[PDB]
């Protein structure tokens, strides 16, 4: 935007292919995957006979 000699321009993280917060979601997903898979070791697999 430009008015009477004062102008401002901004380029945001928002994009047609990715959302603004997509970066944080990607990191959170990464952390959860390590956190959950490691935590699944504390409980282990489930078994049942037949």
């Amino acid at each position: 935007l430009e008015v009477d000699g004062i102008t401002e321009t901004i380029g945001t993280t928002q994009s047609a292919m990715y959302g603004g917060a997509s970066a944080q979601i990607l990191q959170i997903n990464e952390d959860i995957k390590e956190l959950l898979d490691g935590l699944r070791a504390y409980f282990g697999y489930n078994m049942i006979g037949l």
Partner: protein, 49 residues
């Protein structure tokens, strides 16, 4: 000792300005985003000193 003499000097002085004319006086904007209601704000003036 210098009753009848001519004295010459070099000096430093602080800078000073006065306003002769105001150029691009008033610039405006109706800021509304992330506000309870519309607000009026005065953007910077330009001064000719």
């Amino acid at each position: 000792k210098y009753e009848n003499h001519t004295v010459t000097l070099k000096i430093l002085m602080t800078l000073r300005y006065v306003v002769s004319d105001i150029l691009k006086e008033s610039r405006y904007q109706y800021t509304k985003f992330n506000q309870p209601k519309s607000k009026f704000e005065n953007l910077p003036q330009k001064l000719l000193l």
